[PDB]
Enzyme design. Structure first.
Site, PDB file in Angstrom:
ATOM      1  N   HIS A  91       0.818  -1.218   0.000  1.00 43.66           N
ATOM      2  CA  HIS A  91       0.000   0.000   0.000  1.00 43.66           C
ATOM      3  C   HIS A  91       0.850   1.267   0.000  1.00 43.66           C
ATOM      4  CE1 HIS A  91      -4.262  -1.583   1.038  1.00 43.66           C
ATOM      5  NE2 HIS A  91      -3.601  -2.434   0.273  1.00 43.66           N
ATOM      6  N   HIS A 264      -1.116 -12.327  -2.839  1.00 39.81           N
ATOM      7  CA  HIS A 264      -2.141 -13.108  -2.178  1.00 39.81           C
ATOM      8  C   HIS A 264      -1.767 -14.562  -1.957  1.00 39.81           C
ATOM      9  CE1 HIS A 264      -5.416  -9.879  -3.023  1.00 39.81           C
ATOM     10  NE2 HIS A 264      -4.481  -9.480  -2.181  1.00 39.81           N
TER      11      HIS A 264
HETATM   12  O   LIG Z   1      -3.909  -5.569  -0.794  1.00 40.61           O
END
Ligand SMILES: [O-]
Ligand SMILES: [O-]
EC number: 1.11.1.21
Lengths: 733, 734
Positions: A91, A264
């Protein structure tokens, strides 16, 4: 009421403000950020020196140790903070936009408003707090900006994924960067996108019409909405958003799949309780929260009760260890739309294996889950092909992820000469805007003297052309991602050599002449060789010095040698297209748009060049005195002594015997008429006339127009010129 | 729609901003103004030195010449710009508020937003442009700030009114001062006052209830509405507004009548055409207007068609010459309510002599006219008495006006040591917060060392009390009007010695001890004599040095001698009551209110001390380490080594083993609990905890909490301490 506090303070800037009364007036705020006096480390702090004394390996060891040291106020999932830290780093870097070069992790802005409180950064306040003891231990020798990204990099490596390496060198910043256009919406996700889609809710049709230069589908998101476009759980539509948003971040299809599938592999999402249990984001939270936010009232608000995105997805059966479980699950499972405990849309393999581990109870297990945005990767023809290939060849995913993760983290770090530490990857990547090593031996002051004299007496060159060409090359620099500038002589390469704003036919003549000077020198000074880059800058610098002399000021104009010439191979035309200006105030080029006036574009560029209001002002006035417009026109050239470095531009701009009136219907052209003789004397642009209109800019224009300040004008111009010419000189100690 | 542009820019800060999302969050903007890098003259420019080389008499000669050199783009009334220039200067000085010391002419802010575009400054854009050629001629040697006021002063003298003199010394500023609370209204006059009267529309009853610290009856006005309160032409109620507003500017009844009758001897008002013919104010005007505004579309928009206030009043028969025509007309005419050509309320002597001159026709004349705000002066018992007295004795008006005008122009210039030029009035006035000449020879370095040792070995003095007392004295300084500070030792005088924030019982003992040190030195060191003011600062300075040494750091703590001790007669209780803090973050005193939270007051005070965010932060942290709270409490004293100059405050503030919870109802008190042991460890205030909450302040707290930054903390504290102690030292050469 939006943007207004219910209680109206009467201290510390409370009260109705100038920008409230006149919100369309040009603001110089962005030229007053990041001032040295505001830096607690001192304006002369040398971060690179500090970092080089750092015990780098010890720092990584301590970071790796922390990841499995759970803290009771925010217990680690599966006893390992790795996934959280990867998300933190992702992020931080993931706000980057390739076209305008803003966002990214290079200034550590996640720790300030607004990013510290964007919905997509929920609970990253906890992540930043967890690494603070490492920052405290090593002090000034590692910045928050470097530490946030290094922590993610170490997390990958201590979960079994070897990266290419890492470079430090991101100096911290000390206030919110209020220069970034994140969008014009007055809401956050789940709203926050009426403006950026021009009110279209046709999720497929609108996907590739996202407002430029934005790179996220809602205000407050990093890229896309995990529940699908506008929360519509349609994976095919989500894929279109993903391609658009990641594309705006400078990532192609293979980089995009690699980043999502790689990312992920690790950790999990959090949606244990509904949103009404969650308190204010950090910027809205009470003092007792001490910089944290999103307080969760259920239980202790953490561990099994963690609430971040509203989704409860665990992608792989080993969330703390690198695997191919993401793609194996994505492709081999049958997916059904279900609701998370917080009521959000996600996908489950309801007839799949019940062997996905629970983060706090080793005896408890769940079925496979995915986000709508995960299913995107098998609901688009191109993403599907890549996913299929990498399912079979996981080493290809690993290679692509290593490369894309390195790019993500380092895209805005700038030239390779800025990268610090002992594991900077050796491969030269196109997005680093690479530069070769120098040719031959460095020119000395005697060579410089000889070269100045030659340049100022070469066919096709003169003061106006030299000054204009040097500034055109320099103003491609932008501090947000440290791209551009004079090093590399990229004005001589595509695409810059054919930019309309560079007057290509004049430019080719100027460059041919400088190449002749180069050939004459390089064929006759032993092993000494001079670059075209240095000649471009030296030519403009010699021009300025002579122009000063002609104006009656003898000043030594500094020159720093050592620039090198980039090759065209090192200069990707698409990458450099992003540096092409819409307007340039220094050379009186271009026009504004429906959303940005010419003078606003100039102030925005000035901020990217790190200029103060006086520096911006002096440079415009001097460029006009030098006759340095991009087209050689007389627009703004308010002097009878073109090529002499006088403050005539200012003197004549404020001469009340001249009356200024609109000529063009478009607001861009102005005529200055002598009120006595009634004759047209001058033509001006908005970049010219703003200096006589805006009260703070005009105050500066007055200084340079004052009797007795002719020498001051020259000294200030030379200082600003030197600063701008040397912005990209990170190679110099 | 308010405060939002119809076109939403995507450049140069365009886009939704942090302050839009979280508008109640503390902002540090006011600590980032006026930074040296923004000053086109450079940080090392010394305006006083520049002004010293100015050909002052030549400047005044040139201003005088300009007054009657009419420019065709803005023709002079009666061929004399004098009245316009007096208004320019009066409006520049006339924004001053005594309570917070903001506004005034001392920063030359009339040339920036918002003042350049307030309705009451309509057409002063023309006035400032008229004097630009003089500024152009003299360059850096006279500031815009000085020039605007000098122009008014020279205008008076050339129209026959000898002033007391003038002092220069106002260095220019280079950006709009967005630290001033001008009000919370979202409209200008004729609206712009619902908030400041708390929605009261009863104009007589509400007049003495104007929101503090404000000094105008509408947003965008200098003092009052010339048509009467809320445009109701009632002179009696106008008088009550005048008293309130001028009182808020530090002027009494005598001063008020003198300024109004003195000013309105000159020139005229302008209300020739309807407001509908007037274009945008300067900040809203197009580029072609080049900094001007209120373009008037009737004829050339100037001369006979001038439209400024909407009123068309000529007060005297000789508007370019000093006279007593104003009071004569006011008292000896009977007045009837009429309309100006623009439709505004004014008064006329409809049975009066037709001998008031037209500004552009020497053969045409009019009857006498007055504003409602002028009639106020005979519709209040106290004003009527002064007015009648001065009708008979205009020499008394002249004396009062000279004094009030000088005060108006110089009230925010600060100490007399700042006043420059060859005609500084010799009289010392109370509003100058005067200081005596020094007594004795100045102490040298060896004397300073001997005095530090004496102080530190004196019973009743310790590091905490010495540091606390010095800072309490220093933080009275405010840069807006250059009042306050340590020079004068006014902490020893009324009212400061009784301020509850100064812990008067403790202060008395500290001062008695310092007075013993003084007695012991003075008379035993030849001609050298030390002031109590220097001992207060030297005591704190010695304390800081000792505290650093006790923390393992040998550092020079600079001291600049030469302060003097004011007398009570030089120290006005009213004037000084305005410097009394309601909250003090450096010494953990007091609290804020709904509209000014504790931490907001702290940042506002920091701005007035010219502190940067790092300077504010280091000082708070150091004061806590020193145990320098006003009452010696442990609130915020997050250290096991009180009196040693360490960054413990920051280290402990950010220690995640401490959990912070509210103790009281009002959110002002906080308890810090050890999460493991569950015991209360610390008590904190909002001034303490904001440094661990606000993201930008916390970033600084982290710097001082970092391992390896201990020496840096001491160095930064000492630099900030020195800065604050020396803010009022205008007597020392820069
Ligand atoms: O993410
Ligand atoms: O006035």
């Amino acid at each position: 009421t939006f943007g207004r506090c219910a209680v109206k303070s009467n201290q510390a800037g409370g009260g109705t403000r100038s920008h409230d009364w006149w919100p369309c007036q040009l603001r110089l705020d962005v030229l007053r950020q990041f001032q040295p006096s505001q830096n607690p480390l001192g304006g002369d702090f040398d971060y690179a020196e500090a970092f080089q004394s750092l015990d780098y390996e010890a720092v990584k060891k301590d970071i790796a140790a922390l990841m499995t040291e759970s803290q009771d106020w925010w217990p680690a999932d599966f006893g390992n903070y790795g996934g959280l830290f990867v998300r933190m780093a992702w992020h931080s870097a993931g706000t980057y936009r390739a076209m305008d070069g803003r966002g990214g992790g290079g200034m550590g802005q996640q720790r300030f408003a607004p990013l510290n409180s964007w919905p997509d950064n929920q609970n990253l306040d906890k992540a930043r707090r967890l690494i603070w003891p490492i920052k405290q231990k090593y002090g000034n020798k590692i910045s928050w900006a470097d530490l946030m990204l290094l922590t993610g990099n170490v997390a990958l490596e201590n979960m079994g994924f070897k990266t290419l390496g890492f470079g430090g060198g991101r100096a911290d910043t000390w206030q919110s960067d209020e220069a970034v256009y994140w969008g014009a919406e007055t809401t956050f996700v789940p709203q926050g996108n009426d403006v950026r889609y021009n009110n279209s809710v046709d999720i497929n049709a609108r996907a590739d019409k996202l407002e430029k230069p934005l790179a996220a589908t809602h205000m407050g998101l990093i890229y896309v909405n995990p529940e699908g476009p506008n929360g519509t759980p349609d994976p095919a539509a989500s894929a279109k958003d993903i391609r658009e948003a990641f594309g705006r971040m400078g990532m192609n299809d293979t980089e995009t799949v690699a980043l999502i599938a790689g990312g992920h592999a690790f950790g999990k999402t959090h949606g244990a309780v509904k949103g009404s249990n969650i308190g204010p984001a950090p910027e809205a939270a009470d003092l007792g929260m001490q910089g944290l936010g999103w307080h969760n009232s259920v239980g202790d608000g953490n561990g099994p009760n963690q609430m971040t995105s509203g989704l409860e997805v665990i992608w792989t059966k080993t969330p703390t260890k690198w695997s191919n479980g993401y793609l194996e699950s994505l492709i081999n499972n049958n997916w059904t739309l279900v609701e998370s405990p917080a009521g959000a849309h996600q996908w489950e393999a309801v007839n799949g294996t019940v062997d996905y581990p629970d983060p706090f109870d080793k005896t408890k297990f769940r079925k496979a889950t995915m986000l709508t945005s995960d299913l995107a990767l098998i609901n688009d023809p191109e993403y599907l092909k890549i996913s299929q290939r990498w399912l079979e060849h996981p080493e290809e995913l690993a290679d692509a992820f290593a490369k894309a993760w390195f790019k993500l983290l380092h895209r805005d770090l700038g030239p390779t000469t800025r990268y610090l530490g002992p594991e900077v990857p050796k491969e030269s990547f196109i997005w680093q805007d690479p530069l070769p090593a120098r040719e031959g031996d460095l020119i000395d002051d005697a060579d410089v003297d000889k070269l100045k004299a030659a340049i100022l007496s070469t066919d096709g060159l003169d003061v106006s052309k030299l000054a204009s060409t040097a500034m055109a090359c320099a103003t491609t620099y932008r501090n947000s991602d440290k791209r551009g500038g004079c090093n590399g002589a990229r004005i001589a390469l595509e695409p810059q050599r054919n930019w309309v704003s560079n007057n290509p036919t004049q430019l080719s003549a100027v460059l041919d002449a400088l190449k002749k000077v180069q050939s004459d020198f390089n064929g006759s000074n032993g092993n000494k060789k001079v670059s075209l880059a240095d000649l471009i800058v030296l030519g403009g610098t010699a021009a300025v010095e002579k122009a000063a002399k002609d104006a009656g000021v003898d000043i030594k104009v500094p020159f720093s040698a050592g620039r090198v010439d980039a090759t065209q191979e090192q200069t990707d035309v698409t990458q450099f297209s992003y540096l092409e200006p819409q307007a340039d105030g220094f050379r009186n080029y271009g026009r504004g748009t429906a959303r940005a006036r010419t003078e606003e574009i100039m102030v925005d560029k000035a901020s990217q060049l790190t200029l103060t209001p006086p520096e911006l002002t002096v440079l415009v006035g001097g460029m006009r005195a030098l006759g340095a417009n991009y087209d050689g026109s007389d627009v703004g050239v308010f002097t009878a002594n073109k090529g002499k470095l006088t403050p005539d531009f200012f003197v004549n701009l404020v001469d009340m015997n001249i009356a200024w009136t609109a000529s063009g219907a478009d607001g861009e052209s102005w005529v200055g008429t002598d009120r006595k003789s009634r004759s047209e004397k001058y033509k001006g642009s908005r970049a010219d006339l703003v200096f006589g209109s805006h009260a703070e800019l005009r105050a500066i224009a007055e200084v340079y127009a004052e009797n007795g300040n002719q020498e001051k004008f020259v000294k200030d111009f030379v200082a600003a010129w030197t600063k701008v010419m040397n912005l990209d000189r990170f190679d110099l100690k």
